[PDB]
Design an enzyme around this catalytic site. Sequence first.
Site, PDB file in Angstrom:
ATOM      1  N   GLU A 196      60.369  29.242  53.745  1.00  0.00           N
ATOM      2  CA  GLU A 196      59.511  28.169  54.237  1.00  0.00           C
ATOM      3  C   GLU A 196      60.033  27.662  55.586  1.00  0.00           C
ATOM      4  O   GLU A 196      59.245  27.274  56.451  1.00  0.00           O
ATOM      5  CB  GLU A 196      59.449  27.015  53.227  1.00  0.00           C
ATOM      6  CG  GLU A 196      59.018  27.434  51.818  1.00  0.00           C
ATOM      7  CD  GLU A 196      57.532  27.736  51.698  1.00  0.00           C
ATOM      8  OE1 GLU A 196      56.951  28.323  52.637  1.00  0.00           O
ATOM      9  OE2 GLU A 196      56.949  27.398  50.646  1.00  0.00           O
TER      10      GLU A 196
ATOM     11  N   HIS B  10      58.723  29.792  58.120  1.00  0.00           N
ATOM     12  CA  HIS B  10      57.327  29.449  58.382  1.00  0.00           C
ATOM     13  C   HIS B  10      57.283  28.278  59.363  1.00  0.00           C
ATOM     14  O   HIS B  10      56.483  28.272  60.303  1.00  0.00           O
ATOM     15  CB  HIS B  10      56.615  29.082  57.080  1.00  0.00           C
ATOM     16  CG  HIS B  10      56.501  30.219  56.113  1.00  0.00           C
ATOM     17  ND1 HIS B  10      55.928  30.082  54.869  1.00  0.00           N
ATOM     18  CD2 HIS B  10      56.895  31.512  56.205  1.00  0.00           C
ATOM     19  CE1 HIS B  10      55.972  31.239  54.235  1.00  0.00           C
ATOM     20  NE2 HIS B  10      56.555  32.124  55.023  1.00  0.00           N
TER      21      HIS B  10
ATOM     22  N   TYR C 136      55.625  28.035  63.286  1.00  0.00           N
ATOM     23  CA  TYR C 136      54.680  27.057  63.811  1.00  0.00           C
ATOM     24  C   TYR C 136      55.171  26.439  65.117  1.00  0.00           C
ATOM     25  O   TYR C 136      54.371  26.097  65.981  1.00  0.00           O
ATOM     26  CB  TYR C 136      54.374  25.986  62.756  1.00  0.00           C
ATOM     27  CG  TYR C 136      53.419  26.496  61.698  1.00  0.00           C
ATOM     28  CD1 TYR C 136      52.174  27.015  62.056  1.00  0.00           C
ATOM     29  CD2 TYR C 136      53.763  26.490  60.345  1.00  0.00           C
ATOM     30  CE1 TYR C 136      51.293  27.521  61.100  1.00  0.00           C
ATOM     31  CE2 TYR C 136      52.886  26.995  59.376  1.00  0.00           C
ATOM     32  CZ  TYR C 136      51.653  27.508  59.765  1.00  0.00           C
ATOM     33  OH  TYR C 136      50.779  28.013  58.828  1.00  0.00           O
TER      34      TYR C 136
ATOM     35  N   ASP D 261      54.006  35.763  52.111  1.00  0.00           N
ATOM     36  CA  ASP D 261      55.125  35.057  51.492  1.00  0.00           C
ATOM     37  C   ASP D 261      54.615  34.060  50.455  1.00  0.00           C
ATOM     38  O   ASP D 261      55.162  33.963  49.359  1.00  0.00           O
ATOM     39  CB  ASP D 261      55.946  34.295  52.540  1.00  0.00           C
ATOM     40  CG  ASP D 261      56.697  35.209  53.487  1.00  0.00           C
ATOM     41  OD1 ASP D 261      57.003  36.359  53.101  1.00  0.00           O
ATOM     42  OD2 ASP D 261      57.003  34.766  54.614  1.00  0.00           O
ATOM     43  N   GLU D 262      53.575  33.312  50.810  1.00  0.00           N
ATOM     44  CA  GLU D 262      53.014  32.322  49.896  1.00  0.00           C
ATOM     45  C   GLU D 262      52.558  32.964  48.590  1.00  0.00           C
ATOM     46  O   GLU D 262      52.630  32.339  47.529  1.00  0.00           O
ATOM     47  CB  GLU D 262      51.842  31.581  50.553  1.00  0.00           C
ATOM     48  CG  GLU D 262      52.204  30.898  51.864  1.00  0.00           C
ATOM     49  CD  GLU D 262      53.343  29.895  51.728  1.00  0.00           C
ATOM     50  OE1 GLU D 262      53.823  29.408  52.770  1.00  0.00           O
ATOM     51  OE2 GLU D 262      53.754  29.590  50.589  1.00  0.00           O
TER      52      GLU D 262
END
Lengths: 339, 339
Positions: free
Chosen positions: A115, A118, A122, A237-238
């Site tokens: 995460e 991630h 962003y 990944d999610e």
Amino acid sequence: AYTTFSQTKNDQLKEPMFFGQPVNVARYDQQKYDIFEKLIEKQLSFFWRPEEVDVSRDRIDYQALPEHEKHIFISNLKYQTLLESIQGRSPNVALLPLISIPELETWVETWAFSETIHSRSYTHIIRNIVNDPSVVFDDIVTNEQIQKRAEGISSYYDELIEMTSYWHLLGEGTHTVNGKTVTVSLRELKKKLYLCLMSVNALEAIRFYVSFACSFAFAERELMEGNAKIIRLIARDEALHLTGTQHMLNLLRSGADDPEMAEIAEECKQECYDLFVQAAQQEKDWADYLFRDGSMIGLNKDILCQYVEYITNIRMQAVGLDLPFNTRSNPIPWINTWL
Amino acid sequence: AYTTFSQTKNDQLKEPMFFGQPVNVARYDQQKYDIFEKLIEKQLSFFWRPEEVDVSRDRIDYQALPEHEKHIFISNLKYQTLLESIQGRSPNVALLPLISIPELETWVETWAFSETIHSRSYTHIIRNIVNDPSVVFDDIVTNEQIQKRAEGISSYYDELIEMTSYWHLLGEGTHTVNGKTVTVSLRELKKKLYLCLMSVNALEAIRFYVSFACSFAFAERELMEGNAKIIRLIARDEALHLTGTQHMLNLLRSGADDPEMAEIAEECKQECYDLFVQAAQQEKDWADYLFRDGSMIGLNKDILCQYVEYITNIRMQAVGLDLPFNTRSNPIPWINTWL
Ligand SMILES: [Hg+2]
Ligand SMILES: [Hg+2]
Ligand SMILES: [Hg+2]
Ligand SMILES: [Hg+2]
Ligand SMILES: [Hg+2]
Ligand SMILES: [Hg+2]
Ligand SMILES: [Hg+2]
Ligand SMILES: [Hg+2]
Ligand SMILES: [Hg+2]
Ligand SMILES: [Hg+2]
Ligand SMILES: [Hg+2]
Ligand SMILES: [Hg+2]
Ligand SMILES: [Hg+2]
Ligand SMILES: [Hg+2]
Ligand SMILES: [Mn+2]
Ligand SMILES: [Mn+2]
Ligand SMILES: [Mn+2]
Ligand SMILES: [Mn+2]
């Protein structure tokens, strides 16, 4: 009463997933539930570096976007960023102190780590499409519409974390803290963890996907190509993350793990249902803000609402809950191409 | 209390490393201390997978080793595994609830993640050199000679974690819990953090390195080469980890990040010195057990002792502590081929 290395030689194959003896030795030659080892293995195989993705043409794309489309794109991105910020730290802070089997402990740390990647992706996108990232990041914290859609996420984690500290510090029983009567019930803490996990499942399996649909709507137009590549990687990944929470939840429900957790899942089932219904409404209410300056061809309040009901039913069925929405076919079959 | 998303819009560039407002947005376009962003990037660039290292010949090498040499190798391996078990979870559980700048928060999670990979590599080695890994893993928890520093190491973490919980739950002041007076002091908590970080610095900078010398001694004789390749990768990671703790400690003691911590550090300087020397002594005493059945080529009680003093002097000077041992050149220059 938490310890970073319990000195008791215990059989890690016989501990419950949560609330058992804190994990001492980190071993991966065996496991109570191999699904978590498989997930770690899979997540590691998907390792990717955000800064490697070419997003040099995204600035040109974004700039040439109609003002309302810039609003739609950026609002969606800010929300995704908010969720990743929370998901980068929360699994570790809220779950680590309660895990009692090695494969799950490491899975959580690996999940949390992914995460943060991630979140890094962003920043990579933001800094490459806007002049001053600070305006975007600061708005994430202040924007009432964004915090409105996310309302309940941080609050739940925080409550679980606080109750966990009380449990580790005082243990089970009724205590007197600064003249106040504080009750520490393991059963209640288990309920809080269980519902927290259900909320995380809804976050991973619903909230993230509704946002992916918005991101990919631009990909369909052959715009924001860099962002699209990143979202595809994030979504991959999610998928692993939600697989993990669904398994945690269904294993607890089966009664094959902590017997008490099986009872709790059953008795607290209306609460599970209610949290999904509330999350769905929050995702729907977000439409008013997202499309305040106008909508896009194939992407508007009605379509978003339809997709929320579509995916919510799918996710709820996966964990054994009744369906709140009328059944329907995928309102945006084009999203399959990106998932 | 702790929160997974502080609602206040704050300037993350002006927050202290620890004890400030909990980190809300995870952004990486700016840092108060770029060293942490640099470490995250370097660690990500170093990502490796244990299973991809060929350790197929390590089994025969191990079986062919004289009994005392098996003792030396496996005893050292068990200690490394113990340290990685602790390091995989501890930085997250102990530091995440206290960090107030994004770059440091993500570095800690990345650092912890890398340690879990190290633990996974040890399972990879163990399952490839022994018939029943369980024998090795269980001994890690109960081994009297090993389980001595683990107690001291886990103690510093456990005490910091407990006091942190009291701080988040009750805040500063004189409280009462079930008839007992409980005093919560931010100054004492800051001291506990400083001591904990110093201990972790000694773990990363000295304890791990002493163990590497033993592993590579076998490598020099072209034995346990699979293990050696894995240790080379692990050591490359530890270099980053110790760089991180050194910067944390130096920034805290200089007074540039938090005057109070600087005041506290000067106050407990003698304590940190004794803490470091104690760690070195423990590593030294480990020789009595390691070489009880005999020694090997280029590795013995005296050589190891010399290396411990050599490395300790370097590390202590690096964080502003006086040198406890006589100065001299590297007693085992050959180790540089691997570090
Ligand atoms: Hg939660
Ligand atoms: Hg949760
Ligand atoms: Hg959408
Ligand atoms: Hg429930
Ligand atoms: Hg349920
Ligand atoms: Hg609808
Ligand atoms: Hg520490
Ligand atoms: Hg520590
Ligand atoms: Hg050694
Ligand atoms: Hg050594
Ligand atoms: Hg000190
Ligand atoms: Hg000091
Ligand atoms: Hg020594
Ligand atoms: Hg010596
Ligand atoms: Mn994510
Ligand atoms: Mn996720
Ligand atoms: Mn390590
Ligand atoms: Mn390390």
